[model samples]
Target chain A: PMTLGYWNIRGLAHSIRLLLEYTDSSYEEKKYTMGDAPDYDRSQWLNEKFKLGLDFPNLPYLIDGTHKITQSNAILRYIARKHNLCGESEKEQIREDILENQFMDSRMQLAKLCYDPDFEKLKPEYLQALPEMLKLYSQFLGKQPWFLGDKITFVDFIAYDVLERNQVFEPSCLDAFPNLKDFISRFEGLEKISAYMKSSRFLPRPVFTKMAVWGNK
Target chain B: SCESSMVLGYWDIRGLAHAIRLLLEFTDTSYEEKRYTCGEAPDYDRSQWLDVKFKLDLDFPNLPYLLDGKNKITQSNAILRYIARKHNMCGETEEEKIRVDIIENQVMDFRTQLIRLCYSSDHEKLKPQYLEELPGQLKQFSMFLGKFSWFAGEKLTFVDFLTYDILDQNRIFDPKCLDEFPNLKAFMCRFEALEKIAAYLQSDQFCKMPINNKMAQWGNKPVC
Candidate 1:
């Protein structure tokens, strides 16, 4: 069984956790505060290194029987490969790759407004930029309820998580783009995930939190 | 602080430009190198950058513009990535590519913000704040490496060059910076060992930076 230690924040690891569960790979989710990881008082980093001869270094560190991996997307992709994610087709993989990259980039652009001190300066760009980007992205997404064709791939989750985060962290953020809003609503209609989304563990930002979990596989 | 090529080799001049400089020499990719010279305030040549300044958007507000054949562009960070991708300098999987992009984006955010912090304040007050911030940022990045071989996991993405280029440059302004982040120090050693990058960095190619470059002095065309 693999083990995953991650933060409770609505950050990067949620994607990894969801991938793990989707793959039905047995794993544990170790949660912590941001300060605990970096303060250096023999926190989790020190704990795992001495005990398992592994240094997870920070949150979202996934430990397998013999291998330790870091970086949020690296872990997710690692799971995707090992577990036949995105289906066993080249087209599936390519679509998955491009979508993931695009979605991640979109989130970073959005962060320019949500996080940067001078986000106001860039808000116009975000406003001018996102609806077009989303409309374009939604065209691909609308084709089949996912960014990559018929079968659901990582792109769907990535898009959903990013859109969800934006929706909650900054209300009315996506009001300008009806297509994206509809796509997110359609995603909420996903049966099992929607159920998991309703429970107590459900963080308000279901897109990311729902993506980060390990159960009912 | 090598360049970012949008117009010519701005990628080689500013942002990830130095990394490309290291890469070309390392991989033995041969090309001609030209150094620019800036005139002092009293004796400067205003016409030197007249054509380029006027023709180029200059919207990004900086450069190491790349000019190859008919294409011309700006944005050093974008250029560094373009050169790396154009030259077959990335990892070999969809996963690898996505992970690499994520890593580069992360460090770019840090380096960009850090650079702004350094330049925004007075010379005297800036160094201390940067020194303090560098360790924590480096630690965050270092902690990522501790779980894997590279920032993007086992594969060495163009991100390796994009990241350390700044760290290497940071030492000149603040020496005590990386010492606090041992993992980064160790991880940096991994790339520093590459024969080409390592050797060129130690050679004249790295030492004699191009002239006529304003970024080196942080100034602009004068009104004579």
Candidate 2:
């Protein structure tokens, strides 16, 4: 009952929430305006962050009752390992973190494609950057069921959510990329994620943003 | 740019090279830094560095050759991690250090994706892809940073600086690239807002580069 407080925005929380729900831990998924970032409630963020003895400042922060954690990628790893989200072994744990980190990066790059108007507004630059990236991504994802090994790990959440977000924006941009599109469907089909996918509480919002520009439609 | 002493070589503004700059700067160490453009590429004129590259172990690949006193090294990942460990940026526990390594690789992989978006062809198709992909990726990274206070830990670590500087440069190609990662935006603001880093970025060392009369560069430096 450590109330894993996070804003239900369509951001990094997808993986973190997946990690929690995927792990079957219970907590609060508090949605916020852009106002509630790094940590919700500024007075609380100021009062609470210092008490945690950390060096970060911002939202999407987690307060595990007493201990407060900052940085989404770092928090998920802690939660993954602490709650046994990493597979049941040491090697699995390490790979769990590694793949999660890698997937996390891929996840973030996609976000840049959306909101960064400077990048988005520039027709010629981003136009070329995308397909070339798809080509490279195809190389890494070649013939693999998952990024690490067979079973879905923490990385699955990050990769799956990224694809979900991708399909929302560009549709089949990744569909022709071979297994990638299939991978998202298949991964979400997993028992843990499948349950959450249906809940609507866990699914990402702005399903049409992918088709619409960041602010358009 | 290490001079007569120990120096590192890298393609000016490339992936591996950026991390090397962070590693050195993080530790406040000085070495010679020789940057190569297509025009002044070492491949074209190895004569000046003819014996120089081999002597400095530039054999691994052209750019990012690090000569440590007399030793040579390659691979940005390797060199950045090495410097981090040497400077204690690896965190406290062995497991923590390993976790730190994973974070380093994660940022590096993300950097590759950013670099890919900068590729020189088919940008229009690529543009839509990037546009769609942004929100989720930004959310994921921001959430992660939301976990730990620093990139690695309490004191500013090599991973923190290495990753930040590299991500910061994204503004050159597109400011929007940096925007989608909101927590990243917060992180960048907070990180660059640091005293030491803020000082360096403002100093003549990082002073505005001159681009060209024809190239406005929008937010980028002007042509010299």
Candidate 3:
């Protein structure tokens, strides 16, 4: 069995948790909770941060036997590589690599806005630019059932996670892109994903930490 | 057997294009650059790029884009991986692949910290705190690279190119930053000593200064 450690929030670990469940990999969670109010004490994670033997001690780490990995995307690749889910052809690989990085940029943009102290002032601009951002994704996704076409690659997990976050940020954000909406539905409709969504292990609230202005729960 | 050369589009400055430029030179890839220059401050007008931003036929149009025939790429790391894949520089073995993945994301986090500080309005106020935390950041990278020739173990992967650009940027920001880590200093020299890199460094095409755009408070002007 593997151990995935992260904050109790959805955060960077959502996609990893989804992938683990979808792959049917036997993994346990080590959910660390930050303290309330002013201090927000982090001793729960800090005390054991260095002892984990991770090269870069960070949230959302994966420990599978001797293999210890950090960085959310790196962990996704680690698990994806095991199932041969990292695309097949050179073209597919290029698409996968492109979306993997592209999605991070999109994710951070939302995170920056949510975490900003001036979320109210920034909200309008973010929403104004929302369509343009979704348009690119809509065009990239096109008629293909998935981002990389036919088969579901690891990037779809990343894409679904980020796109879902955007939709949560603004419910009508995906109204213009039917394909993206279908992509979301197609992903959630999966057997393992649907089952996990209903399971006790699933985490969907507080998309970000208490430090953020939005989605902090 | 002739194919049209690839076109790499970015600002005239180093910015995000540094690693892509380095990898292209190292791989000896035939590519031409379309460098855009922004107007001077007050406004710092960006019509130079915005005029053609959406016209480029890119899926998610943005700066530091690479057009290799019909395939257009935007993200910097994505561009590095594209060039790397052609040369088989993305690592092979499982261990090597894992290391490559880690360095790719890790270097981005490292670079972002510097970029945020450089572009911030409080650069002067943040400088002291950034400097204080700098050593602890460098030490982790030093520890990670211990006894290894390159970032992804013995193999020279794309992250090495990414790491080199960030480390070099930091060295420019604070000359003494790498002094505490001899291995890191040696790694910098080893990277510079590569035949193509050495030649590129001396070439007219190289843009070493103005690491950021005109808006940045530091590294925004060329050193004489």
Give me the candidate number with maximum TM-score: 3
Residue A195 lDDT (model 1): 65
lDDT of 3 by residue, A1-217 (tens): 8999999999999999999999999999999999777888889999999999999899989999999999999999999999888888878988998899889989999999999999999999999988988898899899999998999988999999999999988899998898899999999999999999999988888899877899984
Worst 10 residues of 1 chain B by lDDT: B215-224
Model 3 CA deviation exceeding 4 Å by range = B1-4, B205-209
Extract clashing residue pairs from model 3: none
In model 2, the runs with Cα more than 4 Å from the true position are A4-6, A34-55, A83-113, A116-128, A207-217, B1-9, B13-35, B38-89, B93-224
lDDT of 3 at A112: 95
Tell me the whole-model lDDT of each prediction, alpha carbons only. 0.57, 0.57, 0.91
Give the Cα error of residue B81 in candidate 3, in Å.
0.4
Per-prediction TM-score to the true structure, in the order listed: 0.58, 0.52, 0.98
lDDT of 1 by residue, A1-217 (tens): 7878765555676566555545557766776532322242435444554464333344567777656666566567666657655544534543454456567667766654555556557666666655556565656555475566666666566777788776665567667766678778877776746665675644443233222221100
Backbone clash count, each prediction separately: 33, 61, 0
Candidate 1, residue B29: Cα displacement in angstroms equals 7.0
True contacts kept of 1: 0.00
